[PDB]
Amino acid sequence: SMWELTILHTNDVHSRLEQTSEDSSKCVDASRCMGGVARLFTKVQQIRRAEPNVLLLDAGDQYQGTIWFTVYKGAEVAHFMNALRYDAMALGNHEFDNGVEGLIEPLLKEAKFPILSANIKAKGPLASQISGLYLPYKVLPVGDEVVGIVGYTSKETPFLSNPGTNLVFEDEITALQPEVDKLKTLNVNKIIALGHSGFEMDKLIAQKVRGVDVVVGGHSNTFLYTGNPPSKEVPAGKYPFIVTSDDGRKVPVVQAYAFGKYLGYLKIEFDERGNVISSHGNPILLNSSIPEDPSIKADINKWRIKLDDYSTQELGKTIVYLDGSSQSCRFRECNMGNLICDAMINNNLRHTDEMFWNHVSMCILNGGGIRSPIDERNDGTITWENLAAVLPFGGTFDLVQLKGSTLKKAFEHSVHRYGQSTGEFLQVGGIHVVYDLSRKPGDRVVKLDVLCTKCRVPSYDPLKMDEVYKVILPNFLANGGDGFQMIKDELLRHDSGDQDINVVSTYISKMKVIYPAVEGRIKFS
Amino acid sequence: SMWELTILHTNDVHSRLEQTSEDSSKCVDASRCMGGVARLFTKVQQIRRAEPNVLLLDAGDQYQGTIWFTVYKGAEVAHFMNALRYDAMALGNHEFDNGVEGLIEPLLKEAKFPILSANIKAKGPLASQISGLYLPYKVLPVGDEVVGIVGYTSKETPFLSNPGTNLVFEDEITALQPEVDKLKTLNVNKIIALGHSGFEMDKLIAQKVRGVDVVVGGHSNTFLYTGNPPSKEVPAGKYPFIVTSDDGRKVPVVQAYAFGKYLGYLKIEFDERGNVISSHGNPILLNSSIPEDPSIKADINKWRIKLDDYSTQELGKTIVYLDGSSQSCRFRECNMGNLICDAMINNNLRHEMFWNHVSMCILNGGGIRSPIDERNDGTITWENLAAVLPFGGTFDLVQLKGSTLKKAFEHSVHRYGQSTGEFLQVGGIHVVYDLSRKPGDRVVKLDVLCTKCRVPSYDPLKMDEVYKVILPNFLANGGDGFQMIKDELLRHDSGDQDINVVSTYISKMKVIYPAVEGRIKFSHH
Ligand SMILES: O=P(O)(O)[C@@](CO)(COCc1nnn[nH]1)OC[C@H]1O[C@@H](n2ncc3c(NC4CCCC4)nc(Cl)nc32)[C@H](O)[C@@H]1O
Ligand SMILES: O=P(O)(O)[C@@](CO)(COCc1nnn[nH]1)OC[C@H]1O[C@@H](n2ncc3c(NC4CCCC4)nc(Cl)nc32)[C@H](O)[C@@H]1O
Ligand SMILES: *[C@@H]1O[C@H](CO)[C@@H](O[C@@H]2O[C@H](CO)[C@@H](O)[C@H](O)[C@H]2NC(C)=O)[C@H](O)[C@H]1NC(C)=O
Ligand SMILES: *[C@@H]1O[C@H](CO)[C@@H](O[C@@H]2O[C@H](CO)[C@@H](O)[C@H](O)[C@H]2NC(C)=O)[C@H](O)[C@H]1NC(C)=O
Ligand SMILES: [Ca+2]
Ligand SMILES: [Ca+2]
Ligand SMILES: [Zn+2]
Ligand SMILES: [Zn+2]
Ligand SMILES: [Zn+2]
Ligand SMILES: [Zn+2]
């Protein structure tokens, strides 16, 4: 006997409730838009009507990304995941962005599906308060069988979000194995690991956690595909990606890029003892060929009414593509980063009363903080809604005084694990940096010139290790985020500045028409 | 028996009627201001009271440079040169900026001193109208002797000014020699060549024109000094500069920088036959240690009242020194050039579909005529801007082949080192020169902002591609020897008035801070 299971999966949807452009920015030309929950619902139902055994799983980071989340604060997540009848969700790092209070009340209490993480352990007064609102696993009836779904969440959540001091994030593999072993003693012979630690950790789970049949992941925005890919995303490997486990088995690993653009689809043939005989599938592109379900669409447009205040006023105009995509902004100089750094610098010089920062000419900005492009076609209008998707996190652009030695180490940290699509890669203003990636980690910065301070005419001069420099940067970086521990520990002064989104909108309003270029601020030799 | 003559001389005063800052920009801090006609008058009288034989000579380019000339149109030049009792002036190129009618009516008819040029010949109806209003020479009584003063004016005047089609500008050496020979047959044994063609031409006149005892020049802003110089100007050689003529004699050549900052002072010992036995002197720095003459200052203040409308409104603020000096803007990237090119680009995007993505700018360095100072709250008025951009040109739009553009960048540095105005300031262009290479093949790198691209980046210029550039009408019309532009351009549209563009930009930006960014570089070998 064989038993067939269809796994449908989303990850890193990031508040893209409505359909979007091809690059996940706002939908303008409806005929070429993609994703959104209403389209997803249609494709899910087509599969459900065709296959008997279907699970619809989310691998986390539903929270944060557009004005949907700014206004509704996770209540939209509960509502539309409930309407889609998700079977389970794993907690991502962004689910803790509004604290544990912003997780509990909006999402955990209102979800009609189990929410999972086996490596998150509650301590003190929070333990009884959150008890049973999330679970380490759920065992789900699927026709005549059961399927065990075990959850996990990135160990980096305390450095990326606001989980608070009364949660502990354990190692995934140490936390998962006892739960998986327990499930076997409970006669659960089919086990899916569902979680939010990235493709590299997903592969290690597949390899090391004995009993895991399939891994459904998130957090790295990993596109996997078998065959000719249907859009711009370049596959990192085949779908499914096959890990050869230490216990001698083939464990498929899946992810479905991000932003609800694709629906993950994996058909698994199990034997009677719960072992994978075979699996096949591919992410399904949610393009115009799949219609938006009318009922969901009507419900989305009902919730949309409150959001239209944010798209009323044109702040200004771009005449160039504002490339705020992760493929650009985490690997090389991107023009959206240049815009944000120039706005940071420009708006700080408005504050003429405060003398200590009134010539600040230097800027750093983590590429992973840039969260959407903006499109120039159809008259390139920029509203608050457009900006909210670029800069969703509600942080500030703060002022720090740093030694040149601290800054050189930050630029080394910027490319220490380069190639892995990590957020710590720095966009800059008033700095020209040259990297040589063939050199060893910690010695890749071959040139670092900065705008002078004690000079009448600003020019780019070599950074001196013993000099001191005034930089404008996100509070996330000032507070030691993205492993920038040298900044937090070595900084000499640190002042709070203005709110990030307000800074960029003011700049755009003043400039009216923007046209930021890639200029050679970051080069590679 | 020896006979001693003191030559006092100014050149390229360029409408600096009032005292100025050290760099010839507007006077703000009075205790460190310099020049102006009232201070000059004080120093002239001190010399005149002490030496019996004194001539005060001007070597041209009184016309053009500040709102004095905008408002009074040369009437200020006549009035204050008359008050100083100049003995003679040679016509410079800028004396023709308002046409021959702008020379005749304001200056030639109202000057109480001879105005000189021996290589300017009037033809047709103009000949009888201008007859005797300027002269090729004047023979001046000085004590019990006479001194011949023979005039000359740059051959380049028709390509730099508006002399009109009824003047011919002859070769200096060919035009001077017959007049100098004539003067000898009239028993004038002491001859000064006074003129406006530049230090290199001045040297050739000294060398080749037999009978010339001394050359007093202008037009190259050449600082000559013997000993330790008193201010920021680097001497190009000794004062006087000694030429060995073809007939073996030692001919002193003098110039006195520009802007009325210095008074040229040369003592000459003549024998009874009019040979130069010896000479010595130096330019005298007209700093605060010489008081402004009270009567001239009172008169200046009377004429000043009309001008104060131009200094009423603050257009905006700079927080950096705006280096618009010739020593910067004709030799390397200057930040005033970057400001003007960015203003040109920015203002054009306000408007017309064919030019609405123009990202490339070229600007002749010699068109930038003053710095602006950042100290004392760095205020920018119209008066400040009028000294930067005095010429009343427009910022025009051209379509050009890449081959035309590469040839322009070769012409930009073909005779580099001579302080010539054709050196180009740029926007949306990164140019690298190797000066060790031969003239016409110094451009080793030339990258430009792309047009048919979503994200603007700097890509190598293609010889066969076509490019859209914003530039002065002076360069569009083939000025500064940019003959390739006029002859090869594919379209040419008139744009906005130059000063209005820069003031609008400053008003929009409020606070400006242009840097030297690496738009123009020089390579090692
Ligand atoms: O799955 P995640 O966690 O979202 C993903 C993991 O690699 C993949 O995101 C792909 C993607 N999605 N959309 N665009 N890019 O990126 C995370 C990256 O985001 C940046 N970051 N993380 C947090 C954060 C922040 N503060 C928060 C603290 C409390 C709440 C707000 N402020 C800023 Cl300016 N930047 C921040 C970092 O550079 C980080 O490395
Ligand atoms: O003694 P001159 O002639 O002024 C001096 C000779 O080398 C030395 O000037 C040192 C100095 N003085 N103050 N600052 N720099 O520079 C002349 C340089 O000036 C620029 N130029 N010349 C004319 C001109 C123009 N049109 C005119 C037509 C009617 C009147 C206006 N438009 C423009 Cl944008 N630029 C123009 C060129 O680059 C030229 O090469
Ligand atoms: C929506 O996506 C599908 C999936 O990629 C596209 O369908 C493909 O179309 C091309 C021809 O244009 C064929 O070579 C493929 O075989 C099709 N794949 C299928 C049906 O799975 C479709 O073109 C997209 N819709 C658009 C562009 O409107
Ligand atoms: C005005 O310029 C003169 C130079 O002509 C300055 O006088 C010189 O001052 C230094 C000391 O500061 C002496 O070593 C020189 O011997 C002086 N030279 C002459 C010719 O007097 C004078 O300081 C300047 N005035 C200022 C700065 O107000
Ligand atoms: Ca199994
Ligand atoms: Ca003689
Ligand atoms: Zn995510
Ligand atoms: Zn994540
Ligand atoms: Zn001049
Ligand atoms: Zn001149």
Side-chain angles (χ1 to χ4, degrees), chain B residues 6-78:
Chain B
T6 297
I7 292 172
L8 305 185
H9 62 104
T10 56
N11 61 277
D12 299 276
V13 172
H14 283 302
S15 315
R16 299 317 193 271
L17 279 288
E18 297 173 87
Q19 70 185 348
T20 66
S21 179
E22 197 154 31
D23 68 4
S24 309
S25 65
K26 189 173 170 54
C27 183
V28 181
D29 182 358
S31 60
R32 294 197 193 193
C33 284
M34 303 187 178
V37 294
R39 190 169 282 105
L40 173 54
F41 183 83
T42 301
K43 183 47 67 173
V44 168
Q45 299 304 78
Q46 289 170 351
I47 294 158
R48 278 183 177 144
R49 65 163 93 131
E51 321 299 347
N53 312 317
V54 182
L55 296 172
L56 175 62
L57 307 180
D58 190 87
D61 276 7
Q62 283 270 341
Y63 273 35
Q64 202 81 256
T66 66
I67 57 173
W68 282 92
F69 186 72
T70 316
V71 171
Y72 292 114
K73 312 185 171 187
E76 81 292 0
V77 177

Side-chain angles (χ1 to χ4, degrees), chain B residues 4-274:
Chain B
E4 196 182 53
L5 178 66
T6 297
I7 292 172
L8 305 185
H9 62 104
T10 56
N11 61 277
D12 299 276
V13 172
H14 283 302
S15 315
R16 299 317 193 271
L17 279 288
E18 297 173 87
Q19 70 185 348
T20 66
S21 179
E22 197 154 31
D23 68 4
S24 309
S25 65
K26 189 173 170 54
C27 183
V28 181
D29 182 358
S31 60
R32 294 197 193 193
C33 284
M34 303 187 178
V37 294
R39 190 169 282 105
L40 173 54
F41 183 83
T42 301
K43 183 47 67 173
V44 168
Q45 299 304 78
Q46 289 170 351
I47 294 158
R48 278 183 177 144
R49 65 163 93 131
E51 321 299 347
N53 312 317
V54 182
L55 296 172
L56 175 62
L57 307 180
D58 190 87
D61 276 7
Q62 283 270 341
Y63 273 35
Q64 202 81 256
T66 66
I67 57 173
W68 282 92
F69 186 72
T70 316
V71 171
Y72 292 114
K73 312 185 171 187
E76 81 292 0
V77 177
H79 185 76
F80 289 107
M81 294 186 73
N82 287 346
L84 274 56
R85 292 176 229 97
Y86 276 85
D87 297 290
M89 176 187 182
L91 295 165
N93 55 292
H94 287 272
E95 276 74 50
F96 299 91
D97 279 5
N98 293 339
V100 198
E101 295 305 332
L103 177 49
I104 288 164
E105 288 288 324
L107 180 56
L108 302 184
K109 288 201 177 178
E110 302 306 320
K112 291 169 191 176
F113 51 93
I115 290 161
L116 305 179
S117 192
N119 69 312
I120 299 172
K121 299 307 193 305
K123 301 200 174 181
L126 187 53
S128 67
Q129 189 187 324
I130 210 166
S131 179
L133 298 184
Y134 77 104
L135 297 167
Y137 66 76
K138 193 77 167 179
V139 178
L140 295 190
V142 188
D144 298 297
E145 298 294 320
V146 297
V147 179
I149 300 167
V150 68
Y152 59 98
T153 308
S154 177
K155 268 192 286 174
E156 305 309 300
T157 305
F159 316 110
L160 303 169
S161 200
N162 296 299
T165 61
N166 294 319
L167 298 173
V168 180
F169 291 80
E170 300 193 327
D171 178 65
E172 289 87 338
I173 290 151
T174 312
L176 286 163
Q177 191 65 84
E179 301 292 344
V180 173
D181 289 337
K182 189 180 171 196
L183 289 167
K184 189 162 181 178
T185 63
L186 302 165
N187 297 332
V188 188
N189 66 20
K190 289 173 282 291
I191 291 156
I192 304 171
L194 179 63
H196 196 90
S197 310
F199 182 50
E200 295 302 316
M201 184 52 69
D202 295 338
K203 286 183 282 181
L204 295 171
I205 292 172
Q207 192 198 331
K208 304 184 157 177
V209 186
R210 188 185 60 268
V212 174
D213 299 304
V214 189
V215 179
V216 180
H219 191 69
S220 45
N221 291 24
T222 303
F223 183 58
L224 300 181
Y225 206 81
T226 296
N228 299 146
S231 183
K232 307 283 183 181
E233 293 68 33
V234 184
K238 300 211 159 276
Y239 186 106
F241 183 88
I242 304 300
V243 173
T244 294
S245 73
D246 295 336
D247 67 338
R249 66 172 65 223
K250 308 307 200 171
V251 180
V253 179
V254 293
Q255 195 160 145
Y257 182 56
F259 315 127
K261 176 157 175 176
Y262 296 91
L263 178 54
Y265 172 86
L266 187 72
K267 269 182 161 180
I268 306 149
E269 287 286 351
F270 284 101
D271 70 13
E272 74 193 30
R273 297 168 218 77

Side-chain angles (χ1 to χ4, degrees), chain A residues 307-490:
Chain A
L307 308 186
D308 288 319
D309 304 319
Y310 292 91
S311 63
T312 322
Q313 199 203 23
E314 173 167 70
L315 299 167
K317 195 183 171 190
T318 187
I319 57 173
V320 301
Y321 188 67
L322 300 168
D323 188 356
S325 70
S326 71
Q327 295 90 341
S328 291
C329 297
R330 306 187 179 206
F331 291 82
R332 59 183 69 77
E333 179 185 0
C334 71
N335 74 330
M336 180 73 85
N338 295 350
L339 179 60
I340 298 158
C341 264
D342 293 354
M344 285 158 77
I345 294 160
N346 195 257
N347 177 92
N348 184 68
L349 305 164
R350 191 177 168 145
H351 291 288
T352 55
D353 68 320
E354 192 68 57
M355 294 286 188
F356 194 77
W357 311 107
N358 76 338
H359 295 280
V360 164
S361 63
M362 289 173 60
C363 174
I364 63 166
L365 174 65
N366 57 304
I370 300 161
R371 304 302 288 206
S372 184
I374 296 168
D375 193 79
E376 85 284 17
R377 302 169 275 119
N378 310 281
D379 305 313
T381 293
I382 296 164
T383 65
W384 200 276
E385 180 179 0
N386 299 128
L387 293 184
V390 184
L391 295 170
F393 303 135
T396 55
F397 295 139
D398 286 6
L399 290 144
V400 294
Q401 188 179 34
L402 315 168
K403 297 180 262 222
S405 79
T406 316
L407 260 177
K408 189 166 179 191
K409 287 152 55 164
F411 280 101
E412 295 294 353
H413 184 67
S414 172
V415 301
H416 85 288
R417 60 188 183 164
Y418 182 93
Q420 292 164 233
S421 205
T422 46
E424 74 260 3
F425 190 82
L426 293 170
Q427 301 296 320
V428 303
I431 302 168
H432 294 159
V433 63
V434 188
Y435 302 114
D436 190 348
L437 296 174
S438 73
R439 299 172 78 82
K440 293 196 173 177
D443 203 60
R444 287 160 167 184
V445 178
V446 298
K447 195 143 279 180
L448 189 53
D449 299 330
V450 296
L451 282 167
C452 56
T453 305
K454 191 184 173 183
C455 57
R456 299 195 62 178
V457 175
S459 60
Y460 288 79
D461 291 279
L463 171 138
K464 294 187 177 180
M465 299 289 282
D466 72 328
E467 274 305 317
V468 179
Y469 298 96
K470 299 166 191 193
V471 187
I472 185 158
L473 78 189
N475 69 312
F476 177 75
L477 293 186
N479 296 315
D482 260 342
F484 278 97
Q485 188 70 4
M486 78 300 291
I487 290 167
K488 186 205 188 171
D489 284 331
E490 305 175 14

